[PDB]
Amino acid sequence: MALFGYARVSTSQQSLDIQVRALKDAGVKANRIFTDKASGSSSDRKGLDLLRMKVKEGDVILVKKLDRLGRDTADMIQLIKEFDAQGVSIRFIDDGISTDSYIGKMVVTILSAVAQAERQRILQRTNEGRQEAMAKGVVFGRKRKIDRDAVLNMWQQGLGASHISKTMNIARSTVYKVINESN
Amino acid sequence: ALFGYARVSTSQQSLDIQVRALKDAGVKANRIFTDKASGSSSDRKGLDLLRMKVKEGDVILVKKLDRLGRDTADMIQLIKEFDAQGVSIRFIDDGISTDSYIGKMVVTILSAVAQAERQRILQRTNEGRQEAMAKGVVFGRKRKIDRDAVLNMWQQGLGASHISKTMNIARSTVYKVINESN
Amino acid sequence: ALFGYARVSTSQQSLDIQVRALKDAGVKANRIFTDKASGSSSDRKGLDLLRMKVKEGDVILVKKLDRLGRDTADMIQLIKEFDAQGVSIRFIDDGISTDSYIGKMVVTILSAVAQAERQRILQRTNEGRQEAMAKGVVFGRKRKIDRDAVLNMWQQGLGASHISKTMNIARSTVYKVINESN
Amino acid sequence: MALFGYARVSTSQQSLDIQVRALKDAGVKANRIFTDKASGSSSDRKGLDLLRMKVKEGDVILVKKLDRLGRDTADMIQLIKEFDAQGVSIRFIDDGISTDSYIGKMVVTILSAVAQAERQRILQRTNEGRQEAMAKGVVFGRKRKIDRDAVLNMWQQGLGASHISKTMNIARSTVYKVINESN
DNA sequence: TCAGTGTCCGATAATTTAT
DNA sequence: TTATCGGACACTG
DNA sequence: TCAGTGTCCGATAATTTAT
DNA sequence: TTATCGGACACTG
DNA sequence: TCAGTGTCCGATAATTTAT
DNA sequence: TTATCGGACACTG
DNA sequence: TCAGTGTCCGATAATTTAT
DNA sequence: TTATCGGACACTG
Numbered sequence: 001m002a003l004f005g006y007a008r009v010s011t012s013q014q015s016l017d018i019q020v021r022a023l024k025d026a027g028v029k030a031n032r033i034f035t036d037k038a039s040g041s042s043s044d045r046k047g048l049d050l051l052r053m054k055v056k057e058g059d060v061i062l063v064k065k066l067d068r069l070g071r072d073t074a075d076m077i078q079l080i081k082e083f084d085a086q087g088v089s090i091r092f093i094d095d096g097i098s099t100d101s102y103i104g105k106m107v108v109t110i111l112s113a114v115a116q117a118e119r120q121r122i123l124q125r126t127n128e129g130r131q132e133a134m135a136k137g138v139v140f141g142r143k144r145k146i147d148r149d150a151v152l153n154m155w156q157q158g159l160g161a162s163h164i165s166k167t168m169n170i171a172r173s174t175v176y177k178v179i180n181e182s183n
Numbered sequence: 184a185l186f187g188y189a190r191v192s193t194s195q196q197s198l199d200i201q202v203r204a205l206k207d208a209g210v211k212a213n214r215i216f217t218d219k220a221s222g223s224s225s226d227r228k229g230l231d232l233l234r235m236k237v238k239e240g241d242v243i244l245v246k247k248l249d250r251l252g253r254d255t256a257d258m259i260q261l262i263k264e265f266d267a268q269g270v271s272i273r274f275i276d277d278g279i280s281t282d283s284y285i286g287k288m289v290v291t292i293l294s295a296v297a298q299a300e301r302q303r304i305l306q307r308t309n310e311g312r313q314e315a316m317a318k319g320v321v322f323g324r325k326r327k328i329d330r331d332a333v334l335n336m337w338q339q340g341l342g343a344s345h346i347s348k349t350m351n352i353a354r355s356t357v358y359k360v361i362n363e364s365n
Numbered sequence: 366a367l368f369g370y371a372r373v374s375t376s377q378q379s380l381d382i383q384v385r386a387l388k389d390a391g392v393k394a395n396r397i398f399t400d401k402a403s404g405s406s407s408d409r410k411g412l413d414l415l416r417m418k419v420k421e422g423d424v425i426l427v428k429k430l431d432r433l434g435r436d437t438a439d440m441i442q443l444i445k446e447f448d449a450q451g452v453s454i455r456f457i458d459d460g461i462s463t464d465s466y467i468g469k470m471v472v473t474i475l476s477a478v479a480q481a482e483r484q485r486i487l488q489r490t491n492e493g494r495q496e497a498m499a500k501g502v503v504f505g506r507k508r509k510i511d512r513d514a515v516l517n518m519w520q521q522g523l524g525a526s527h528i529s530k531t532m533n534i535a536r537s538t539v540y541k542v543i544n545e546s547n
Numbered sequence: 548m549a550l551f552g553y554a555r556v557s558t559s560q561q562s563l564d565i566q567v568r569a570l571k572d573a574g575v576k577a578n579r580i581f582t583d584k585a586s587g588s589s590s591d592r593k594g595l596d597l598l599r600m601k602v603k604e605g606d607v608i609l610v611k612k613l614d615r616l617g618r619d620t621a622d623m624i625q626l627i628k629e630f631d632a633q634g635v636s637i638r639f640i641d642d643g644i645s646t647d648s649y650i651g652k653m654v655v656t657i658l659s660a661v662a663q664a665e666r667q668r669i670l671q672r673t674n675e676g677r678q679e680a681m682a683k684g685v686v687f688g689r690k691r692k693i694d695r696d697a698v699l700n701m702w703q704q705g706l707g708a709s710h711i712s713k714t715m716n717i718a719r720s721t722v723y724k725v726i727n728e729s730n
Numbered sequence: 731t732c733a734g735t736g737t738c739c740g741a742t743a744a745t746t747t748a749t
Numbered sequence: 750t751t752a753t754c755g756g757a758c759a760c761t762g
Numbered sequence: 763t764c765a766g767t768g769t770c771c772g773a774t775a776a777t778t779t780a781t
Numbered sequence: 782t783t784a785t786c787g788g789a790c791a792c793t794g
Numbered sequence: 795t796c797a798g799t800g801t802c803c804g805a806t807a808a809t810t811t812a813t
Numbered sequence: 814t815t816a817t818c819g820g821a822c823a824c825t826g
Numbered sequence: 827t828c829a830g831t832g833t834c835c836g837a838t839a840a841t842t843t844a845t
Numbered sequence: 846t847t848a849t850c851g852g853a854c855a856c857t858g
Contacts, residue, residue: 102306106299109295110295
């Protein structure tokens with residue numbers, strides 16, 4: 001009975017296609033999938049909240065890998081428990097377990113917290129390797145896309161600030177920031 | 184600061200045997216907290232108290248890990264709270280603290296594999312019982328009143344009230360006895 | 366073909382309570398095997414037998430998983446043997462068989478986390494004992510002979526042999542008694 | 548006291564350099580490392596057998612990740628047990644555990660068999676994705692590096708077979724194989 | 731003193747499949 | 750997994 | 763011929779710590 | 782682990 | 795009827811670090 | 814994490 | 827004023843299955 | 846889980 005597929009992304013890319021094509025592949029219907037994209041912190045995975053609602057006693061959700069049904073373990077279990085309360089299991093295709101039975105769920109918890117700990121360590125590296133470049137004089141973030149030499153030229157040549165922002169189609173504040181910064 | 188939390192769910196006084204295990208692990212009595220649990224989830228008021236009277240640099244001891252939580256989802260919440268509060272929990276018998284970031288992993292595995300085996304017991308108990316039940320095993324409180332007496336009075340045609348007075352027993356009982364034994 | 370292996374290491378007859386658990390799980394007595402273990406690692410001769418009398422398509426039942434192996438390294442060898450022999454093991458109480466390829470994983474985790482807790486008990490027992498020992502607890506067999514008797518004879522100057530004859534006790538004992546109680 | 552580093556490879560490449568530079572990095576001495584390369588099935592990881600021998604009670608071995616101290620779990624434990632018998636622990640740098648104590652070893656066993664099961668599944672895919680290409684008419688293995696059209700030309704033009712292999716500096720058998728195959 | 735022919739095979743080489 | 754090198758081994762001149 | 767003294771030790775039974 | 786048991790062994794009378 | 799100036803800030807954009 | 818856009822908000826003409 | 831009949835039920839105590 | 850207890854409630858005399 002009823003077979004629903006969930007998918008997700010966080011790489012902020014079209015990585016999405018491979019996932020959904022694995023669901024449909026393993027016998028899902030296009031009219032039974034739901035997806036969520038990464039917006040930021042608050043991003044309340046809207047689609048999933050809907051999923052919860054249109055599934056009934058004797059359904060199964062398919063998920064590609066594990067870390068697609070929510071981020072950290074705490075959520076993962078609650079999330080699972082929510083489903084198990086409506087009477088619904090989850091197959092994880094690649095990882096091979098199912099929220100089908102007692103013994104499974106455990107494996108999901110174990111398997112989870114193995115990584116949520118393996119995660120916390122990749123950071124400690126990705127971070128350290130980030131900071132090491134910082135003090136080594138590496139430039140971070142968005143590239144200065146304004147001709148700042150050209151705007152310093154305006155103010156020094158005593159002229160109204162708003163007028164300036166009206167001549168390059170830019171924000172007013174920015175012009176104040178630019179100069180209030182570079183003196 | 185050295186704190187000890189304890190718990191007992193058998194509705195027993197096994198508490199005094201657990202609290203010693205920490206009293207002997209260095210914890211002073213002013214800094215121990217307990218909980219009798221007897222029907223709900225809000226009965227962790229003794230912990231509710233601890234959960235506040237602690238500060239950064241403290242450590243709380245618990246005998247076995249399965250006393251602190253219940254289901255692993257409660258477990259992690261409990262850890263997590265204390266965690267970013269700045270306290271650590273150390274499990275005496277089991278031999279882990281949440282000190283290391285890798286402690287936490289164990290603390291989760293170690294339990295979700297218990298919580299598995301715990302749920303198995305339940306499933307395996309109900310059936311073990313249900314089995315016994317049908318096989319002929321009498322249940323609950325032992326019948327204590329001499330029932331063959333009360334019936335005798337009634338079959339001898341005697342108003343109910345009288346009967347409950349001449350054995351100093353409850354009237355409902357009389358009625359129950361005879362309402363049941365027919 | 367439905368096979369059941371069993372084991373008991375307490376040096377007890379708890380065997381008959383385990384063997385029933387499979388006799389009642391469908392296994393016929395012709396197809397059950399046991400082992401008393403009492404001092405070595407070669408005493409799995411009852412399994413040595415099973416390990417051969419089985420073929421492809423069979424299944425062996427075991428009550429709890431920790432009866433089949435000892436340390437997890439033995440566990441996996443045992444599984445592995447049966448595995449590429451074509452038989453499967455199903456753990457009654459625990460509720461896993463080595464049937465699925467993912468069963469095997471559990472069977473390993475499930476145990477290495479036991480084998481942990483098992484080793485902890487040992488460490489925690491030795492100390493619990495050693496503790497008691499020094500605190501004043503007498504150990505081993507209870508002294509049964511009336512020692513105050515034997516000494517009386519000797520302090521009364523009586524050849525040892527006589528003494529062991531007039532209580533029908535061992536001569537070494539006499540000597541031991543008096544060699545000890547001075 | 549004494550700190551020994553083990554490293555290993557199997558990708559049959561110079562992947563080796565990154566590993567050893569992580570050992571030396573985490574405080575090892577060049578004169579305390581040992582390495583093994585992948586030869587095939589029998590490859591008895593010679594270096595490691597030597598390692599076992601020159602370490603004593605109160606040493607520690609460093610290993611980059613986990614799957615470098617032997618392949619499958621069964622070995623992994625035996626291997627470990629061998630060391631623990633001489634009284635020697637193992638730190639695994641990236642994975643973060645140590646054969647230091649009871650509770651660790653377990654984690655190593657768990658952590659191991661999680662993957663040795665996750666391994667067995669990658670195969671089932673890498674295999675299926677291999678076979679799918681097979682029937683789809685994909686050509687497998689070593690490329691035919693002989694001018695076979697030129698050797699068929701020799702035999703059909705009735706000439707001694709050995710002579711042939713003496714004119715292209717090739718193996719005799721090959722010439723028989725070539726023709727005994729392509730007719 | 732070897733001399734060439736036709737099989738069958740372990741050992742290396744060069745490739746390919748998907749994480 | 751498929752392609753080549755070297756050879757050992759049985760015949761036959 | 764056989765009787766006793768005293769030290770040691772392998773083979774059982776008895777008991778214990780802790781779940 | 783300790784207790785008790787037969788029973789071997791080396792001297793002694 | 796707005797009219798321009800100088801701060802301080804949430805929301806998006808475009809980047810970078812190492813598995 | 815750093816750069817830009819839009820604005821709301823307090824003054825001042 | 828007050829006495830009895832009979833049904834229900836919340837509040838304790840008593841007991842049990844299984845480790 | 847069942848047993849026993851006081852004690853409320855609706856009728857009845």
